[PDB]
Structures are given as C-alpha cells and as structure tokens.
C-alpha cells in the first residue's frame, strides 16, 4: 500500500479519477486507468488556510 497527500482548490477533486482530465490532471498528478485502491477525501477548510 502507498499513501499521498495533496492540496486541491475546490471543484477539481472530481477530476481525480481513473481517466478524466483537467487542469491538475495534465500538468500534475494523474491517475492511471487500472486504479485498484481508492480515495479518502474530506473538507479540510480547518487547517490549510
């Protein structure tokens, strides 16, 4: 198993997905098309601001 830790800006969490593109899915981290393992995402408007 492996773990990552990002900071996103709002709406483009939905583009973190096996295949979809966007702003930070082309010049940043991009998921592959055979993604086994998945995503734990919450609302951290409490620390990183």
């Amino acid at each position: 198993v492996y773990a990552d830790s990002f900071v996103i800006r709002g709406d483009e969490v939905r583009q973190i997905a096996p295949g979809q593109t966007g702003n930070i899915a082309d010049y940043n981290y991009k998921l592959p098309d055979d993604f086994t393992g998945c995503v734990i995402a919450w609302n951290s408007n409490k620390l990183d601001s």
Binding site: A17, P18, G19, Q20, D33
Partner: protein, 49 residues
C-alpha cells in the same frame, strides 16, 4: 473513445463487441445447418453416380 470515461468506454465497447460477435456466432451456426443439408445431398449424389 472521444469523450467518454475510459473505464466506462470499455463497458460501452463490451456490449458492442458482444453484439458484433453474436452476429458472427449466429452466422457460423447458420452455415453448419446448411453444410449438413448439402452433405445429405452430396452423399445422395455420390450414391446416384
């Protein structure tokens, strides 16, 4: 593949590649019926000659 999700596109092409294969699977079955009908007459033709 132009706009769909590539995991969803492989599901979409699965229902299309099975539909194209079922048309071919039906065709091989239809020739097997027709090959048995001619063989019933070819063995009659060899019986005649």
């Amino acid at each position: 593949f132009s706009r769909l999700d590539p995991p969803e596109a492989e599901v979409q092409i699965d229902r299309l590649i099975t539909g194209r294969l079922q048309s071919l699977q039906t065709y091989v079955t239809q020739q097997l019926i027709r090959a048995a009908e001619i063989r019933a007459s070819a063995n009659l033709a060899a019986t005649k000659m």
